[PDB]
From Swiss-Prot, chains A, D:
Belongs to the immunoglobulin superfamily. MyBP family. The chain holds residues 319 to 357 of 1274 of the full protein. Substrate for phosphorylation by PKA and PKC. Reversible phosphorylation appears to modulate contraction. It comes from the Eukaryota. The gene is MYBPC3. It comes from Homo sapiens (Human). Thick filament-associated protein located in the crossbridge region of vertebrate striated muscle a bands. In vitro it binds MHC, F-actin and native thin filaments, and modifies the activity of actin-activated myosin ATPase. It may modulate muscle contraction or may play a more structural role. It is linked to Cardiomyopathy, familial hypertrophic, 4: A hereditary heart disorder characterized by ventricular hypertrophy, which is usually asymmetric and often involves the interventricular septum. The symptoms include dyspnea, syncope, collapse, palpitations, and chest pain. They can be readily provoked by exercise. The disorder has inter- and intrafamilial variability ranging from benign to malignant forms with high risk of cardiac failure and sudden cardiac death. Cardiomyopathy, dilated, 1MM: A disorder characterized by ventricular dilation and impaired systolic function, resulting in congestive heart failure and arrhythmia. Patients are at risk of premature death. This is Myosin-binding protein C, cardiac-type.
Length: 39, 375, 375, 39, 375
């Protein structure tokens, strides 16, 4: 996918664009797991 | 006894208030939005017989204790009710001090402001949370959608809106509510079954019936041929154990309850079905958003968990939409939590703590602060 | 031995079955809806000692013969009972062949269909009336109201509904029942008087008590100051001849029986008073129907014949209604017959014979015919 | 009143409107007497 | 039973159809452009309960009967509706034969031709009027202006155009519509008041709200300082009797309804305020027509009857116009009738009967005739 690395290297907020670009309607979830990590 | 804090993802799911934390994964709070009054007072030794522990126990006290939503119509008629509702939360199931954990606030549109005004200040004072912040339940699901473009159909705990959206971009003008609540379906169910040979009015009687819907009541895509099916279809002709121990028998209702959301005639409502609410919204949407919708036809609302939900959704939109365009309604199974989930996200969205309702900000601007450039 | 026919205006007034003809003016039939069983059977020479001639004689046989409504709760538990009830009617007091006189049928809502299904066919076969036709007792009174707009409060023989209406236009959604029956008041009366020094349980004991209510028991507009009044008011403190010959003494009951229709607390019922049933109905009504109601606040139901009936009706609606609007409840003295009267009208409504239940129509469509596009 | 003549000359069913217009909630009764005549 | 004829000055005022005759002085016809459907059909004896007598009675039947404009958007979606609308007119309030009285026809621009095609022929056949003739509502007001030079702002029954004109000389190129309709303002009103604590959706609910606007809702010249005024100005803070009998309370809305005609942001419309529509039109106008406008800044449209209407008109044009030139908007109080008035004039303009749509002319050229060298 690279969505992992791309989003980690995505522009800080535009993980919006990258997640929802690569099908990740759960940018919500991408960040929420990243938050269970960073929560 | 830990690091800075966890925001308090508290969600009064239109029927149940529910909550976890920021970054949480499951609302650790879930339970009825009712208050309960016993009647008789058999003179009973001792005490412990609360008037109003509804929370999640009172249904244990169902029958003697009556029922009270404060937000009855997604409309908080009373607050101290909801107040101790919160305290119950924060101190029995949240069993947690507000004062040190932030919280985002779940709300549907259409609320006269003072509702939030009051909720806000009192949350500070009674609660002194580090800071609060409100957010439209609708919007909350929206991010909970993450398909930042497209409408979402929010027919949830007991709520109903259409939420046209477009990479986060939603048109309130096109946005709408359907007063319908699974409670409403509940209603017509009582109507029918009772008149059909049943005497079913009591609060927890309503409890059983709502259980009935959410466990067995459904809808078939079609009606009229579906009607003929009903005319003799024995398979549906199934009795369910009434939790007295009776086995309530069931037929055409199991579906003839919800479907009226497309025809309030049955609720007699002047309104129109959810679907064409969607469709007139979309037509309101710009010329070619509509395909966006079609890919983004996000349903929301668990009580709508019934069969075929999309099945119809698509079929009628078809019946209305140009086959030119390709439709796709969107509805996760987990639509109850979805709203909670996206709220957990936003609040948990670290890059975003600037928004939370600070004690001070209120203080200087009182509650009215909340309104402009903030909610 | 005459011209075409007279429809058979047969009315099972929730307590008594009653009837005349189309265009009639007085239901020539009126009598209890009970069945009666003796116990002992003293070995008695000869015969003529019917088990079940209740009709209007059995109360002559009260005591030994027990009591049986088939429609007990406005719910026909049994029919052959009611069957010979009819025959009694048609052959002793109607003493008339069904087969050649049409009849409209009196019914309250809330009935599972097969009740009417069965009643219908059997009325054809056992009865071969030229044709029948059913009609909601509620609606029957309604035309019996002739104020085609406005609700009617039908608390009658033993029944209770609210009947919002509007030049014939009624909203079933807003329409309701109150399980209360003058029988119910009967009940609490037995409760009180007995516990208060009396031993009053027996079937015709209930007979006497119902007589008591319908002759003397009343209500005072107010309660609590009315309560103090009761505290020493000697005028009410009146004993009535118990039909044994005793003179049952009476005080606060005479009114503390019925009034609970506004507070089932006394019946302990979860329900709410008749008045606010009216009011929540009306609020359900459109914005400005409400004044229509206010002019059309038609009570119905003779057992409710008590004092002040409207007196409260208005006072509380006031207490709830905007004085902006001007209220007027409507209740003829003759509310028992009213329902009969309007039925006599409709059935007697020559321009309307198309509706009657024809033997054939049933025949082709069996009873199920009755339901769609007909009743 | 003229309700008599008006209703006799009222439109056949809308004796409804005329009776209940001229206060005759007993269009019911107007017809029931008319029926004791025509019953 | 008289001399030649009177043309039939029939005017479907965008909300109400209205009319008199040629040379008349008051449109003897005025009433809603709606159709009405009841829902329930309480089984009601007898008849007289029309489905669709909307005309001017149905609002009597409001609530049960729903609402239908055929010209909904100044767009006749349906005609037989409007057909019997006419007949109603011509036979109940016009109660007059079309066949023998000529009529001019009121129309706004933007209509695809067949609309008029059909209306025309059918008016001949169903109507056989001596001859008809159509005329732009816009133009009709225009002569109704009689300031043959200058634009007119036609924001009327529910319509909106700019009508640059110059001794009868108007530039369609510069001419425009604003989709806004007092109905639209109605809308945002419902939006606000409802969300603000109200549940206001129903057809006649819309009726009340439109009444509200046309009786009380206004606008203040300014906004933002006007906004601060609103911030506490108690005088405006006035509740009006809701025609249920409630007294709907009113504040900032009374003006925050209409004003958005200058800022569709509130309607969210991409469009621009009426004023600068005027101004860009005028700039389109020749170099020095503009002063003509300034003397001829004729408003039109009663729903725009609100306060300050010109007050703003001038202030903003000022804000845009060179003070070099002196502005003067023109708006009679009687702007509803104005259009009717000028139509009564033109049609009544004897020197002009040559124009009317003759049966024959159509006949030879069918309807298509209407278009070239005629309308």
């Amino acid at each position: 996918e690279d969505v992992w690395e791309i989003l980690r290297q995505a522009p800080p907020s535009e993980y919006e664009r990258i997640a929802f670009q690569y099908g990740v309607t759960d940018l919500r979830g991408m960040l929420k797991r990243l938050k269970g990590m960073r929560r | 006894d830990d690091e800075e804090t966890t925001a308090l993802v508290c969600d009064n799911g239109s029927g149940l208030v529910k909550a976890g934390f920021a970054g949480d994964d499951a609302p650790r709070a879930v339970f009825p939005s009712i208050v309960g009054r016993p009647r008789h007072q058999g003179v009973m030794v001792g005490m412990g017989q609360k008037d109003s522990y509804v929370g999640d126990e009172a249904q244990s006290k169902r029958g003697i204790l009556t029922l009270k939503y404060p937000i009855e119509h997604g409309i908080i008629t009373n607050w101290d009710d909801m107040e101790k509702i919160w305290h119950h939360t924060f101190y029995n199931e949240l069993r947690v001090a507000p004062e040190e954990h932030p919280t985002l606030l779940t709300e549907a549109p259409l609320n006269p402001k003072a509702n939030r005004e009051k909720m806000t200040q009192i949350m500070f004072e009674t609660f002194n949370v580090p800071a609060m912040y409100v957010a439209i339940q609708a919007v909350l699901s929206l991010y909970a959608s993450g398909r930042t473009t497209g409408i979402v159909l929010d027919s949830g705990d007991g709520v109903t809106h259409n939420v046209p959206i477009y990479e986060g971009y939603a048109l309130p003008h096109a946005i709408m509510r359907l007063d319908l609540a699974g409670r409403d379906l509940t209603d017509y169910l009582m109507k029918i079954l009772t008149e059909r040979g049943y005497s079913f009015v009591t609060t927890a009687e309503r409890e059983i019936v709502r259980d009935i819907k959410e466990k067995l009541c459904y809808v078939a895509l079609d009606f009229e041929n579906e009607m003929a099916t009903a005319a003799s279809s024995s398979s549906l002709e199934k009795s369910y154990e009434l939790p007295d121990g009776q086995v309530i028998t069931i037929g055409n209702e199991r579906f003839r309850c919800p479907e009226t959301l497309f025809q309030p005639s049955f609720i007699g409502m002047e309104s129109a079905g959810i679907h064409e609410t969607t469709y007139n919204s979309i037509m309101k949407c710009d010329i070619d958003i509509r395909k966006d919708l079609y890919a983004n036809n996000v349903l929301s609302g668990g009580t709508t968990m019934y069969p075929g939900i999309a099945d119809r959704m698509q079929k009628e939109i078809t019946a209305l939409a140009p086959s030119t365009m390709k439709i796709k309604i969107i509805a996760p199974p987990e639509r109850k939590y979805s709203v909670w989930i996206g709220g957990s996200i936003l609040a948990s969205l670290s890059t975003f703590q600037q928004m939370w309702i600070s004690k001070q900000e209120y203080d200087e601007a009182g509650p009215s602060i909340v309104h402009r450039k903030c909610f």
